[model samples]
Target: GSSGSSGYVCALCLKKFVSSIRLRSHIREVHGAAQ
Candidate 1:
């Protein structure tokens, strides 16, 4: 099983993911309009 350390929840989308790569993608997709 994966560890809980991987989860970083986005304040914009409220989505949890593993790794910076995943969080970056989520931000780009969900919060790209803010940029």
Candidate 2:
């Protein structure tokens, strides 16, 4: 999630994730797949 390094969900994917870097990645990757 965008919630820092506290290990939360990827706000972009809504997947129980953990990692701000990964969350950023998700925001870049999984953001607007239909567009």
Candidate 3:
């Protein structure tokens, strides 16, 4: 199991992300942001 570590959390849906790249992608894909 992975140890507790800081994660990139989405502001809109409060989704969890282990990587910023995935986080930004999620925001753009799911939230439909121009980011």
Candidate 4:
């Protein structure tokens, strides 16, 4: 998660998370992969 502390980007997908919270949830919810 980007934490909204600065320009937010998904650590995995390398895209903007305008709402860092979205990225946080996305990492959790959208991952059935070998993270």
TM-score of each: 0.52, 0.43, 0.71, 0.48
lDDT of 1 by residue, 1-35 (tens): 34556577786767887766787788878688455
Tens digits of per-residue lDDT for model 4 on 1-35? Answer: 43436557777778766676776777787764445
Superposed by TM-score, candidate 4 places the C-alpha of residue 29 at a distance from the truth, in angstroms, of: 1.7
In candidate 2, stretches whose alpha carbon ends up further than 4 angstroms from where it belongs are 1-6, 32-35
* lDDT (10s digit) by residue, model 2, range 1-35: 24355576765547755666765577666674443
lDDT of each: 0.71, 0.60, 0.83, 0.67
Cα displacement (angstroms), candidate 2, residue 31, comes to 0.6
Q: Give, for candidate 2, the lowest lDDT window spanning 10 residues.
A: 1-10
Roughly what TM-score does model 4 have, to 2 decimal places? 0.48
The candidate maximizing lDDT is 3
lDDT of 3 by residue, 1-35 (tens): 23666778898999899887888899988889982
What's model 2's lDDT at 10?
60
Write down the TM-score for model 1.
0.52
The positional error of residue 35 in candidate 2, measured at the CA in angstroms, is 16
Q: Candidate 4's error at 26, in angstroms?
A: 0.9
